[PDB]
Design a protein around this ligand. Structure first.
Ligand SMILES: *[C@@H]1O[C@H](CO[C@@H]2O[C@@H](C)[C@@H](O)[C@@H](O)[C@@H]2O)[C@@H](O[C@@H]2O[C@H](CO)[C@@H](O)[C@H](O)[C@H]2NC(C)=O)[C@H](O[C@@H]2O[C@@H](C)[C@@H](O)[C@@H](O)[C@@H]2O)[C@H]1NC(C)=O
Ligand SMILES: *[C@@H]1O[C@H](CO[C@@H]2O[C@@H](C)[C@@H](O)[C@@H](O)[C@@H]2O)[C@@H](O[C@@H]2O[C@H](CO)[C@@H](O)[C@H](O)[C@H]2NC(C)=O)[C@H](O[C@@H]2O[C@@H](C)[C@@H](O)[C@@H](O)[C@@H]2O)[C@H]1NC(C)=O
Ligand SMILES: *[C@@H]1O[C@H](CO[C@@H]2O[C@@H](C)[C@@H](O)[C@@H](O)[C@@H]2O)[C@@H](O[C@@H]2O[C@H](CO)[C@@H](O)[C@H](O)[C@H]2NC(C)=O)[C@H](O[C@@H]2O[C@@H](C)[C@@H](O)[C@@H](O)[C@@H]2O)[C@H]1NC(C)=O
Ligand SMILES: *[C@@H]1O[C@H](CO[C@@H]2O[C@@H](C)[C@@H](O)[C@@H](O)[C@@H]2O)[C@@H](O[C@@H]2O[C@H](CO)[C@@H](O)[C@H](O)[C@H]2NC(C)=O)[C@H](O[C@@H]2O[C@@H](C)[C@@H](O)[C@@H](O)[C@@H]2O)[C@H]1NC(C)=O
Ligand SMILES: CC(=O)N[C@@H]1[C@@H](O)[C@H](O)[C@@H](CO)O[C@H]1O
Ligand SMILES: CC(=O)N[C@@H]1[C@@H](O)[C@H](O)[C@@H](CO)O[C@H]1O
Ligand SMILES: CC(=O)N[C@@H]1[C@@H](O)[C@H](O)[C@@H](CO)O[C@H]1O
Ligand SMILES: CC(=O)N[C@@H]1[C@@H](O)[C@H](O)[C@@H](CO)O[C@H]1O
Ligand SMILES: [Ca+2]
Ligand SMILES: [Ca+2]
Ligand SMILES: [Ca+2]
Ligand SMILES: [Ca+2]
Lengths: 219, 219, 219, 219
């Protein structure tokens, strides 16, 4: 009837990958999401995908809050939706990654949320909660724990510069990053420093990944 | 109780043409619509009517998003409402047309939607999905499939010009149109090129129709 | 549980005059209103009161849309709330009036609504539907039927002037009025022409009433 | 299922202090609050906490309306949420206070609300209802009864000055205050007059408290 996330959709008997309506506790109008019903038994709610560089990710605060792109392709679900999902239960984060040779790796975090205790999560800058790494890609996110979300037009980072302008993305930047999955789609090895779709622990600072998917499931 | 569209209203036992409350999945406050309970067994939700040129259709982005006119007369329901309806199920589109001699034709499309997989359908420009033509008016819409919605103040078309300014309407313009049902109410044959209530496949580029109704029903 | 108006509140077993929560069809968050449980058997939803000139009624479009004052005193409920109430069923309007000698009269209208078929009732200017007068005050509203709502900062009247600026109120002005219950609280007989709390059919153009209440009940 | 406040959460069988979802009558999307399940049997909804001066409370109208800080630390829940809570039932207010020596006192008010009968509580300035004092801190709030909320950028006080600018806080200021719990975190005794976290009846005009919590429970 009113699944709160893709795990409710899966447990209701929908086994196919695709677009479904979900209805978080504090977002009762609901919205549509892409559900991954295959990974480790399925029930993952996607909030980010890169796969071909068809969508501009170098967007400002309003676009990162509200979301952009298409559920069937490259997209960012919107921090207001990711907040609505991650505050309603205890969620884990799965990150799938692919290089241009179709090599793959993943990073799993047993704890993930954005603006979890923020009265105004937008004003508070949708700060990241992340813990408990396992996987094959290595950890490129724990160093971002506690950081606010920074865009080219809204600086809340630990740099004297704007990390988002500098590394051409949008992220929970410190000074500045170990990961940059909202970076420019630079298509593999690049001379420029750390300004592509980067996961430093797997492919370092000068390799823009082919594919990323960031997705959540209740623990 | 809470019909999601005019077909739910009809199947609940309301057989009369008129104004009813509907409550789409992701628009739970609901809104009122004109229901056509006669055409091909009935249950059509109207989202556009022209009949007398009493309402200005040469409106900007905000008016096309939010809707204008009156449900009992000339109106545009609003792309935010048409998105809310067409994302909740698989809908067909019916287009009724009339000339100034009370001649009539129709176009049916077995698939229709706006911003179907858009995370932010407004920013994405409420792009048209349309397929599977049958009817008597000929096809004047399939060539618009995949196009974003363009207004005089928001250009997302495939022209070096603004198609909306140029053809004095608001539509899923390419370069520029085969149909222009939101065009100026020019009252039949006109010298100006393709800037009236046009359905090119039926009455060509220099004839502004008397009546149009665009309406949807689940398949 | 969820009364849609003061008549639902009365029929649920609440007999006392006062402030209650109501939940109109298309305003499901609900809001509070003053219920008149005495007049002609009770169940009237108040949307306007004048009684002492403590509240400024010479307000702009946003205040008339959103409402102002206090439910227990002088107030205007807001055209967005009056629209939400009058579109959910067929309502009658009761107008109670008092002069400074505690003389009283009433006007009843068997049909009343604002923006009844408007797709965007705000843009359409919350046009008045009113019919079927009876009472003791005489008819000072039927001549306003079909008129849009005009404020000092939003002119939709049939005057070359702004009727709202000119008669220091906010109303469904034609050219200009027979009634002006949102006029200045001028306290009885005044030299200035028709710019007080006027009901012309009862006390003419140069008498600002002590008390007005405008209230609705389903028929 | 849908507790309206922390007392519903407690009576549903949740005995632990912490963050819970509540769903007020006229705010059905709901929001999260910190519940005090210990004080005088428990079931208190927190709307204000000071404890360490980590959060700036010298904020404007929008921040006081919308809320700021974190539920687990220093925060202000937002006047739009406090209105939604205090209009749904008859609430009492509990104020806990601590000095820098870990000395403690409390003030209890048997009646508390903000914008209780306001049609537009924001425009009306979220005016305070408070009555019926008991406790150990003395009364520093009854003199504020009937006052609108004043911020540095929105003056509704009884001073020729802006009390909020002058006493570096945000409060239901008269001319100007006996309490200032949204004042600067000045850390105990200060030379400056009445511009810290003040409760004048307990620690006078020149002592900024260590800890304050303002919280409500239905009577
Ligand atoms: C890399 O993988 C791409 C995705 O292919 C799918 O996933 C693979 C892991 C595997 O399961 C495969 O069977 C799947 O089809 C490939 O693109 C796909 O290629 C197939 C033809 O084999 C084509 O029909 C699909 O449409 C296409 N998918 C997409 C999203 O483009 C890549 O294949 C290369 O590029 C293709 C466009 C095609 O030209 C093919 O001949 C190429 O090998 C895989 N390789 C690389 C280096 O990108
Ligand atoms: C064209 O059709 C208009 C709509 O008429 C209705 O639909 C028709 C298909 C048919 O079913 C008819 O019986 C319906 O009444 C006509 O306008 C209507 O005319 C009738 C009188 O016959 C009148 O009472 C209606 O109010 C009127 N409706 C509207 C919406 O105006 C046209 O009739 C012409 O114009 C009329 C205003 C009237 O003056 C009549 O004598 C005219 O023939 C039809 N013809 C044309 C060329 O427009
Ligand atoms: C006009 O009526 C006012 C309202 O009084 C109530 O309604 C009447 C129709 C009647 O049912 C009466 O019993 C009600 O009390 C009067 O004001 C009220 O006066 C009473 C004292 O009789 C007082 O206790 C109320 O608080 C007061 N109400 C309000 C809203 O002010 C008027 O009375 C005059 O003004 C009063 C303030 C008081 O001073 C009294 O002596 C005056 O006669 C009525 N007369 C006029 C000319 O205004
Ligand atoms: C004042 O009280 C602070 C809060 O302590 C808790 O509440 C007390 C009423 C009591 O129930 C106590 O058992 C609780 O722990 C103290 O801070 C706490 O101190 C403890 C060590 O005793 C420490 O483990 C806690 O993390 C700490 N809490 C917080 C919120 O900081 C104050 O203790 C002083 O400051 C501490 C940081 C620590 O250094 C301690 O040695 C100090 O005595 C209490 N005293 C004062 C003057 O502030
Ligand atoms: C992309 C980025 O922030 N890179 C590095 C950071 O990882 C490194 O630890 C630091 C050394 O001081 O220099 C930063 O520029
Ligand atoms: C209204 C409109 O866009 N008309 C035509 C289009 O249908 C035609 O195919 C093209 C030829 O290049 O010229 C455009 O102006
Ligand atoms: C307040 C107002 O509009 N008054 C009158 C109107 O009632 C009258 O019929 C008309 C005569 O032309 O003159 C208007 O000014
Ligand atoms: C902080 C504040 O408003 N303090 C005092 C007030 O309590 C006092 O009664 C008044 C004397 O006139 O002077 C004000 O400044
Ligand atoms: Ca910076
Ligand atoms: Ca163009
Ligand atoms: Ca005018
Ligand atoms: Ca002042």
């Amino acid at each position: 009837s009113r699944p709160r996330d893709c795990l409710d959709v899966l447990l209701s008997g929908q086994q196919d990958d695709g677009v479904y309506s979900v209805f978080p506790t504090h977002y009762p109008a609901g919205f549509q999401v892409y559900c991954d019903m295959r990974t480790d038994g399925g029930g993952w709610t996607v909030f980010q995908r890169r796969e071909d560089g068809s969508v501009n990710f170098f967007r400002g605060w309003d676009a990162y809050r509200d979301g952009f792109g298409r559920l069937t392709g490259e997209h960012w679900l919107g921090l207001k939706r990711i907040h609505a999902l991650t505050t309603q239960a205890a969620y884990e984060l799965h990150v799938d990654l692919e290089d241009f040779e179709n090599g793959t790796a993943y990073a799993r975090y047993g704890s993930f949320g954005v603006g979890l205790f923020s009265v105004d999560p937008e004003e508070d800058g949708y700060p990241l909660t992340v813990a408990d790494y396992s996987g094959t890609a290595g950890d490129s996110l724990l160093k971002h724990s506690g950081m606010r979300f920074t865009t080219k037009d809204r600086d809340s980072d630990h740099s004297e510069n704007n990390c988002a302008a500098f590394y051409r993305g949008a992220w929970w930047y410190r000074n500045c990053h170990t990961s940059n999955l909202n970076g420019q789609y630079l298509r593999g090895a690049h001379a420029s420093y750390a300004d592509g779709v980067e996961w430093s622990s797997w492919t370092g600072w000068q390799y823009s990944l082919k594919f990323s998917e960031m997705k959540i499931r209740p623990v």
